[PDB]
C-alpha cells in the first residue's frame, strides 16, 4: 500500500474583497478597514480641555460683552464656537479679525490683569443702551470709554512699562461717530486721532465720521486694534478723542491651544482626536470625517474606505 501526505491552507465561508497591484478586487480570508468614516456626533471633553462658547464668540468674550463675562480669565485647550452665537454690545468691527481670533485661540487663555492707567481730564467708564448690563446702560468690561470733561477733552498721554517676564496683550479701540454733532459732543475736537506704539512699532488711526448700517440702535462703530508688548519694552498711548482705552492686558501664553467651529453637543467620554462632527477614534491611520481636526488624529483622505488584507487568498 503506502500513504498520502497532502499540504494545504485554511479558508473561511465568507471572505472579504481587497484591492492589490494585480487585482482590482480579490478575495482574502480577512481584512481590516483603514479609513475612519463615522463619529458618535459628540465632542468628548477629555483628555483635552474643552470650553463651550455657547452664545459667545471668542472675540466677544475677550472684549467683555456682558452676557459673555462668565468667560473672564478662562482657559481652554479647545474653544468651541457655536453657529447660534450672537453679539449684544456696541456694534464694532475688527480689521484683521481673523488674526486676533487666531492668536487668542493659540494663546489659550483670557487671563486679564487690570493696570492702574491714569486718564487725566476725561470722563471714564462710558456706556450705552446698545450694550445693557442688567437693567442699566453699560460697556465692554475690558475697555474704558473716555469722553470729555467739562467743555474740553485734552491730549491724553500715558505710558505703561512691561516689567514682567511675559508678553502682554493690550486690547484697545477707536470710536467712529455717526455725526459731526456726536463727534464734538463727546470729544470736543472736530477730529480726534489715536496713536499707540512700542519701541519698534507704531499704529495711528484716524476716526471717520459718517453713518454705517443701523445696528442695535447705533449708526456708529468702534474699530478694535491690539498691541503686544514684550518684557523690557513699553506702551505709549496718545489721543485727543475717540479713544477706547484698555483697562489692562491679557497675559500671553504658548502651547497646544486652538479653536473650532461646531454644533456638536459636548459629552462626557474620552477621545484624543476632535473634529467638528464630534470626536473620532484614532486607531486607524486615515479618516474621512473632516479635514479640520484637533489633537492626535488620523490623516484626512478623500477615500471613504480602504481595506488592508490581514489574511491569505480565500479559496473555498
Amino acid at each position: 500500500p503506502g500513504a498520502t501526505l497532502c499540504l494545504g491552507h485554511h479558508a473561511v465561508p465568507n471572505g472579504t474583497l481587497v484591492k492589490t497591484i494585480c487585482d482590482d478586487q480579490i478575495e482574502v480570508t480577512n481584512a481590516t478597514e483603514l479609513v475612519q468614516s463615522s463619529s458618535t456626533g459628540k465632542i468628548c471633553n477629555n483628555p483635552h480641555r474643552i470650553l463651550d462658547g455657547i452664545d459667545c464668540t471668542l472675540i466677544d468674550a475677550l472684549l467683555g460683552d456682558p452676557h459673555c463675562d462668565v468667560f473672564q480669565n478662562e482657559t481652554w485647550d479647545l474653544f468651541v464656537e457655536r453657529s447660534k452665537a450672537f453679539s449684544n454690545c456696541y456694534p464694532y468691527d475688527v480689521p484683521d479679525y481673523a488674526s486676533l481670533r487666531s492668536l487668542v485661540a493659540s494663546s489659550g487663555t483670557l487671563e486679564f490683569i487690570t493696570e492702574g492707567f491714569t486718564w487725566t481730564g476725561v470722563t471714564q467708564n462710558g456706556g450705552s443702551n446698545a450694550c445693557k448690563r442688567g437693567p442699566g446702560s453699560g460697556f465692554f468690561s475690558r475697555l474704558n470709554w473716555l469722553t470729555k470733561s467739562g467743555s474740553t477733552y485734552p491730549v491724553l498721554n500715558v505710558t505703561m512699562p512691561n516689567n514682567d517676564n511675559f508678553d502682554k496683550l493690550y486690547i484697545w479701540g477707536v470710536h467712529h461717530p455717526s455725526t459731526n454733532q456726536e463727534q464734538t459732543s463727546l470729544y470736543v475736537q472736530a477730529s480726534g486721532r489715536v496713536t499707540v506704539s512700542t519701541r519698534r512699532s507704531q499704529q495711528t488711526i484716524i476716526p471717520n465720521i459718517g453713518s454705517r448700517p443701523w445696528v442695535r440702535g447705533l449708526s456708529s462703530r468702534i474699530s478694535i486694534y491690539w498691541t503686544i508688548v514684550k518684557p523690557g519694552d513699553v506702551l505709549v498711548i496718545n489721543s485727543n478723542g475717540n479713544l477706547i482705552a484698555p483697562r489692562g492686558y491679557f497675559k500671553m501664553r504658548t502651547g497646544k491651544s486652538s479653536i473650532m467651529r461646531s454644533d456638536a453637543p459636548i459629552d462626557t467620554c474620552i477621545s484624543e482626536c476632535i473634529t467638528p462632527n464630534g470626536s473620532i477614534p484614532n486607531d486607524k491611520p486615515f479618516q474621512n470625517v473632516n479635514k479640520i481636526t484637533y489633537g492626535a488624529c488620523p490623516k484626512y483622505v478623500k477615500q471613504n474606505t480602504l481595506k488592508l488584507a490581514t489574511g491569505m487568498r480565500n479559496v473555498p
Binding site: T4, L7, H9, A11, S106, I292, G295, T310
Partner: protein, 172 residues
C-alpha cells in the same frame, strides 16, 4: 500569487482547518487526519500584524493649524489657504491608495510563498521515498503508520530507514 501554490497547484483551501494557516492532511492504513503547521503559520502572522505600524510611525499630534472653511469671499489669501489644504489632502490620498495596493500584493505573495516553502521542505525530507502528485500531495511509497506521519510533521523523519522498501515499489 507569484509562487503558484495558493490558488494554484493547491486547488483550494480547507474550511475545516480552524487551528492554523498552513498544515497537513494524510491518509494511511490507520485512517486519515489533519494537523496545523505551527512554524509557517506564526511566520505569516508575525509579518502581517506588525505591518500597519512599521510604516506611518505612530499618529502625528497636531494642534493649531489653519482655517479650512470660510464664510466670506476674501480673494488672494483665502485662495492660497485652500490650495495648500487641497494639495495636502491629494498627496495623502495618493499615499494611502498606493500603500494598501503595495501591502496587499505583498501579503498575497508572502502567504503564497509560505505555502510553497513548506511544500518544498516536506519534499526534501522525503528524498527518493516519495513523489510529488502535482496537487500539493505526496505519494509515499512505503508503509507509514501514524508515528511515521508524525515524524514527518515534526521534522524528524529519517528517509534512509525507508529507502530500500520505497525504491523497490517505485521502479519495480
Amino acid at each position: 500569487g507569484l509562487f503558484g501554490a495558493i490558488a494554484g497547484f493547491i486547488e483550494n483551501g480547507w474550511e475545516g482547518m480552524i487551528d492554523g494557516w498552513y498544515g497537513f492532511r494524510h491518509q494511511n492504513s490507520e485512517g486519515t487526519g489533519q494537523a496545523a503547521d505551527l512554524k509557517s503559520t506564526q511566520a505569516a502572522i508575525d509579518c502581517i500584524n506588525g505591518k500597519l505600524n512599521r510604516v506611518i510611525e505612530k499618529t502625528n499630534e497636531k494642534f493649531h493649524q489653519i482655517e479650512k472653511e470660510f464664510s466670506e469671499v476674501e480673494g488672494r489669501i483665502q485662495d492660497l489657504e485652500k490650495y495648500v489644504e487641497d494639495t495636502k489632502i491629494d498627496l495623502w490620498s495618493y499615499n494611502a491608495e498606493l500603500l494598501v495596493a503595495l501591502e496587499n500584493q505583498h501579503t498575497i505573495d508572502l502567504t503564497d510563498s509560505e505555502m510553497n516553502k513548506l511544500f518544498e521542505k516536506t519534499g526534501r525530507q522525503l528524498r527518493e521515498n516519495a513523489e510529488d502528485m502535482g496537487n500539493g500531495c505526496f505519494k509515499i511509497y512505503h508503509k507509514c503508520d501514524n508515528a511515521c506521519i508524525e515524524s514527518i510533521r515534526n521534522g524528524t523523519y529519517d528517509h534512509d530507514v525507508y529507502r530500500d522498501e520505497a525504491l523497490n515499489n517505485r521502479f519495480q
